mmCIF file of C-alpha atoms and ligand atoms in Angstrom:
data_model
loop_
_atom_site.group_PDB
_atom_site.id
_atom_site.type_symbol
_atom_site.label_atom_id
_atom_site.label_comp_id
_atom_site.label_asym_id
_atom_site.label_seq_id
_atom_site.Cartn_x
_atom_site.Cartn_y
_atom_site.Cartn_z
ATOM 1 C CA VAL A 1444 22.618 18.842 59.511
ATOM 2 C CA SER A 1445 25.275 18.251 56.800
ATOM 3 C CA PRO A 1446 24.658 15.809 54.052
ATOM 4 C CA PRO A 1447 27.183 13.255 52.830
ATOM 5 C CA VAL A 1448 29.778 14.091 50.245
ATOM 6 C CA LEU A 1449 28.873 12.190 47.077
ATOM 7 C CA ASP A 1450 31.133 10.523 44.557
ATOM 8 C CA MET A 1451 30.754 11.087 40.834
ATOM 9 C CA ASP A 1452 28.101 8.314 40.731
ATOM 10 C CA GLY A 1453 26.048 10.181 43.336
ATOM 11 C CA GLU A 1454 26.927 7.633 46.041
ATOM 12 C CA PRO A 1455 28.026 8.762 49.555
ATOM 13 C CA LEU A 1456 31.738 8.787 50.198
ATOM 14 C CA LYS A 1457 32.560 5.825 52.477
ATOM 15 C CA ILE A 1458 35.403 5.812 55.022
ATOM 16 C CA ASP A 1459 38.348 3.526 54.379
ATOM 17 C CA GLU A 1460 37.599 2.908 50.712
ATOM 18 C CA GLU A 1461 39.645 4.057 47.742
ATOM 19 C CA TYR A 1462 38.683 7.101 45.719
ATOM 20 C CA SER A 1463 40.640 9.022 43.079
ATOM 21 C CA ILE A 1464 40.486 12.790 43.371
ATOM 22 C CA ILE A 1465 39.776 14.162 39.897
ATOM 23 C CA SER A 1466 39.860 17.758 38.579
ATOM 24 C CA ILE A 1467 36.410 18.619 37.329
ATOM 25 C CA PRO A 1468 34.677 19.906 35.264
ATOM 26 C CA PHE A 1469 36.972 22.281 33.335
ATOM 27 C CA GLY A 1470 40.068 20.207 32.600
ATOM 28 C CA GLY A 1471 43.098 18.883 34.452
ATOM 29 C CA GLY A 1472 43.911 15.427 35.789
ATOM 30 C CA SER A 1473 44.048 13.494 39.024
ATOM 31 C CA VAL A 1474 45.680 14.094 42.301
ATOM 32 C CA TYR A 1475 48.742 11.881 42.878
ATOM 33 C CA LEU A 1476 51.778 11.396 45.095
ATOM 34 C CA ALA A 1477 55.035 12.728 43.647
ATOM 35 C CA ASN A 1478 58.612 12.964 44.875
ATOM 36 C CA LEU A 1479 59.539 16.631 44.964
ATOM 37 C CA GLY A 1480 63.308 16.542 45.524
ATOM 38 C CA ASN A 1481 64.763 13.025 45.523
ATOM 39 C CA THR A 1482 63.563 12.534 49.149
ATOM 40 C CA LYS A 1483 63.647 8.993 50.465
ATOM 41 C CA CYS A 1484 59.829 8.730 50.334
ATOM 42 C CA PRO A 1485 57.663 10.822 47.995
ATOM 43 C CA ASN A 1486 55.777 13.530 50.002
ATOM 44 C CA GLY A 1487 54.251 15.811 47.359
ATOM 45 C CA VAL A 1488 50.486 15.981 47.032
ATOM 46 C CA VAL A 1489 50.147 17.241 43.436
ATOM 47 C CA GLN A 1490 47.730 17.497 40.575
ATOM 48 C CA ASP A 1491 48.484 16.096 37.111
ATOM 49 C CA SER A 1492 47.703 19.149 34.921
ATOM 50 C CA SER A 1493 48.185 16.821 31.993
ATOM 51 C CA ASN A 1494 49.384 9.844 37.079
ATOM 52 C CA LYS A 1495 46.886 8.959 39.766
ATOM 53 C CA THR A 1496 47.126 7.933 43.440
ATOM 54 C CA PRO A 1497 43.882 7.067 45.197
ATOM 55 C CA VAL A 1498 43.074 8.181 48.724
ATOM 56 C CA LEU A 1499 41.286 6.861 51.796
ATOM 57 C CA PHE A 1500 39.223 9.034 54.167
ATOM 58 C CA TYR A 1501 38.953 8.545 57.943
ATOM 59 C CA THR A 1502 36.747 10.237 60.525
ATOM 60 C CA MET A 1503 36.926 7.642 63.348
ATOM 61 C CA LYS A 1504 33.365 8.465 64.374
ATOM 62 C CA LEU A 1505 31.061 5.713 65.473
ATOM 63 C CA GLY A 1506 27.666 5.980 63.809
ATOM 64 C CA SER A 1507 28.906 7.840 60.756
ATOM 65 C CA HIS A 1508 30.016 5.566 57.836
ATOM 66 C CA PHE A 1509 30.170 8.415 55.352
ATOM 67 C CA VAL A 1510 32.176 11.616 55.002
ATOM 68 C CA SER A 1511 29.779 14.518 55.445
ATOM 69 C CA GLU A 1512 30.191 18.048 54.134
ATOM 70 C CA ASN A 1513 32.278 20.088 56.580
ATOM 71 C CA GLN A 1514 33.199 17.040 58.688
ATOM 72 C CA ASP A 1515 36.794 16.813 59.945
ATOM 73 C CA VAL A 1516 38.567 14.128 57.954
ATOM 74 C CA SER A 1517 42.067 12.625 57.791
ATOM 75 C CA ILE A 1518 43.324 11.586 54.364
ATOM 76 C CA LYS A 1519 45.865 8.938 53.303
ATOM 77 C CA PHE A 1520 47.153 7.988 49.883
ATOM 78 C CA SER A 1521 46.584 4.256 49.278
ATOM 79 C CA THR A 1522 49.568 1.908 48.878
ATOM 80 C CA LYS A 1523 57.824 -0.844 51.956
ATOM 81 C CA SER A 1524 59.962 1.733 53.798
ATOM 82 C CA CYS A 1525 57.318 4.422 53.024
ATOM 83 C CA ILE A 1526 54.338 2.705 54.648
ATOM 84 C CA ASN A 1527 54.041 5.498 57.244
ATOM 85 C CA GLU A 1528 54.541 8.298 54.695
ATOM 86 C CA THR A 1529 51.082 8.506 53.124
ATOM 87 C CA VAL A 1530 49.098 10.596 55.615
ATOM 88 C CA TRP A 1531 48.195 14.034 54.347
ATOM 89 C CA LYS A 1532 48.947 17.118 56.366
ATOM 90 C CA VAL A 1533 49.501 20.852 55.867
ATOM 91 C CA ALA A 1534 52.883 22.573 56.376
ATOM 92 C CA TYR A 1535 54.384 26.017 55.781
ATOM 93 C CA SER A 1536 57.029 26.606 53.189
ATOM 94 C CA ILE A 1537 58.421 29.947 51.927
ATOM 95 C CA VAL A 1538 57.884 30.487 48.210
ATOM 96 C CA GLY A 1539 57.776 32.800 45.220
ATOM 97 C CA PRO A 1540 59.645 35.992 44.363
ATOM 98 C CA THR A 1541 58.308 37.701 47.505
ATOM 99 C CA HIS A 1542 59.512 34.806 49.761
ATOM 100 C CA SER A 1543 56.038 34.558 51.330
ATOM 101 C CA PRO A 1544 54.819 31.720 53.526
ATOM 102 C CA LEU A 1545 52.406 29.248 51.966
ATOM 103 C CA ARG A 1546 51.068 26.050 53.507
ATOM 104 C CA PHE A 1547 51.353 23.073 51.130
ATOM 105 C CA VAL A 1548 49.537 19.732 51.380
ATOM 106 C CA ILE A 1549 52.175 16.989 51.815
ATOM 107 C CA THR A 1550 52.383 13.514 53.291
ATOM 108 C CA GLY A 1551 54.213 12.703 56.544
ATOM 109 C CA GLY A 1552 51.383 13.179 58.998
ATOM 110 C CA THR A 1553 51.175 10.787 61.966
ATOM 111 C CA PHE A 1554 47.730 9.216 61.702
ATOM 112 C CA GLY A 1555 45.711 9.616 64.876
ATOM 113 C CA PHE A 1556 42.609 10.681 66.673
ATOM 114 C CA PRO A 1557 42.058 14.434 66.498
ATOM 115 C CA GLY A 1558 43.709 16.676 69.058
ATOM 116 C CA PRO A 1559 46.157 19.542 69.638
ATOM 117 C CA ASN A 1560 49.071 17.277 68.785
ATOM 118 C CA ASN A 1561 47.949 16.739 65.177
ATOM 119 C CA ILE A 1562 46.147 19.817 63.990
ATOM 120 C CA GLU A 1563 47.999 19.618 60.722
ATOM 121 C CA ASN A 1564 46.171 16.403 59.684
ATOM 122 C CA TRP A 1565 42.579 17.644 59.482
ATOM 123 C CA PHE A 1566 40.741 18.588 56.277
ATOM 124 C CA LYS A 1567 37.150 19.374 55.271
ATOM 125 C CA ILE A 1568 35.227 18.821 52.040
ATOM 126 C CA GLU A 1569 32.682 21.460 51.051
ATOM 127 C CA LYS A 1570 30.239 21.660 48.137
ATOM 128 C CA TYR A 1571 31.525 24.015 45.450
ATOM 129 C CA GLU A 1572 29.280 25.150 42.625
ATOM 130 C CA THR A 1573 30.548 24.606 39.081
ATOM 131 C CA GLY A 1574 27.332 23.783 37.205
ATOM 132 C CA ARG A 1575 28.432 20.110 37.190
ATOM 133 C CA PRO A 1576 26.981 17.819 39.894
ATOM 134 C CA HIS A 1577 29.300 16.375 42.563
ATOM 135 C CA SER A 1578 31.980 19.042 42.494
ATOM 136 C CA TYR A 1579 33.618 19.958 45.831
ATOM 137 C CA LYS A 1580 36.548 21.858 47.307
ATOM 138 C CA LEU A 1581 38.970 20.770 49.930
ATOM 139 C CA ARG A 1582 39.490 23.094 52.866
ATOM 140 C CA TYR A 1583 41.662 23.581 55.930
ATOM 141 C CA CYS A 1584 39.617 24.746 58.916
ATOM 142 C CA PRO A 1585 39.633 22.260 61.755
ATOM 143 C CA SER A 1586 36.747 22.183 64.281
ATOM 144 C CA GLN A 1587 37.660 24.399 67.247
ATOM 145 C CA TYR A 1588 37.409 21.507 69.756
ATOM 146 C CA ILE A 1589 40.461 19.870 68.173
ATOM 147 C CA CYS A 1590 42.637 22.692 69.554
ATOM 148 C CA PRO A 1591 40.635 24.965 71.794
ATOM 149 C CA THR A 1592 43.468 27.530 72.070
ATOM 150 C CA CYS A 1593 44.109 27.608 68.279
ATOM 151 C CA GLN A 1594 43.020 30.516 66.196
ATOM 152 C CA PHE A 1595 43.046 28.810 62.815
ATOM 153 C CA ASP A 1596 43.889 30.629 59.660
ATOM 154 C CA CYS A 1597 41.260 28.862 57.590
ATOM 155 C CA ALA A 1598 41.809 28.524 53.835
ATOM 156 C CA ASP A 1599 40.411 26.652 50.877
ATOM 157 C CA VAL A 1600 42.702 24.295 49.024
ATOM 158 C CA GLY A 1601 43.841 25.233 45.551
ATOM 159 C CA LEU A 1602 46.815 24.664 43.287
ATOM 160 C CA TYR A 1603 50.133 26.553 43.198
ATOM 161 C CA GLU A 1604 52.895 25.807 40.738
ATOM 162 C CA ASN A 1605 56.121 25.117 42.603
ATOM 163 C CA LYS A 1606 59.114 22.701 42.382
ATOM 164 C CA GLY A 1607 57.867 21.834 38.892
ATOM 165 C CA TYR A 1608 54.470 20.580 40.067
ATOM 166 C CA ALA A 1609 50.946 21.772 40.515
ATOM 167 C CA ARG A 1610 50.990 21.457 44.315
ATOM 168 C CA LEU A 1611 47.883 21.389 46.508
ATOM 169 C CA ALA A 1612 48.163 24.485 48.651
ATOM 170 C CA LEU A 1613 46.254 26.578 51.140
ATOM 171 C CA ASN A 1614 46.144 29.613 48.821
ATOM 172 C CA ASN A 1615 42.388 30.082 49.422
ATOM 173 C CA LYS A 1616 41.764 29.807 45.660
ATOM 174 C CA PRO A 1617 39.499 26.764 45.543
ATOM 175 C CA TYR A 1618 40.196 24.209 42.893
ATOM 176 C CA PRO A 1619 37.159 22.025 42.179
ATOM 177 C CA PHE A 1620 37.451 18.253 42.538
ATOM 178 C CA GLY A 1621 35.311 15.154 42.366
ATOM 179 C CA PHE A 1622 35.725 11.694 43.813
ATOM 180 C CA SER A 1623 35.753 8.622 41.597
ATOM 181 C CA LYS A 1624 35.371 5.302 43.477
ATOM 182 C CA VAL A 1625 38.110 2.858 42.497
ATOM 183 C CA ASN A 1626 36.326 -0.424 43.410
ATOM 184 C CA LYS A 1627 32.611 -0.453 42.666
ATOM 185 C CA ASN A 1628 31.156 -3.677 44.085
HETATM 186 CL CL1 CL B 1197 37.360 5.945 60.060
HETATM 187 CL CL1 CL B 1198 29.329 2.801 63.050
HETATM 188 CL CL1 CL B 1199 53.989 24.160 59.557
#
């Protein structure tokens, strides 16, 4: 049984509530939404190395209010033409001097219930030891049932400098984050 992901106050991460994703504990800033190449709507999921755009987590699972470790979760940046351009997903690009494929985290997912049609939407949060409480890593490894014929190339989420930004990327080099609740009530 997997316990809930906890925010930096030690409180379980609740679905559909705003949290900022913060680089901890060794420096760096927040995750935010950036425009990478004068596109109509910004689609870059980036880290401010040293800007903040909170996120909302969704599992659409009756009986589970919280995001648990290793639970499939869909992620949106919080907020007029760009209202449907906030849903996180993963997508291949070709990068670097070796022109090698790398999957970046970007917006432009179509929010939905999990299935073969939207494999790109699904993330996991795992505990990641740093010596500081409440540090985690993001990960791409969707539950097999979401696409039974998929053989996923699972990878932890890290950062890769590209297009002038520290971009969230499936480079399998975990970058530790914590979750800071925006509205404590
Ligand atoms: Cl939900
Ligand atoms: Cl419920
Ligand atoms: Cl792709």
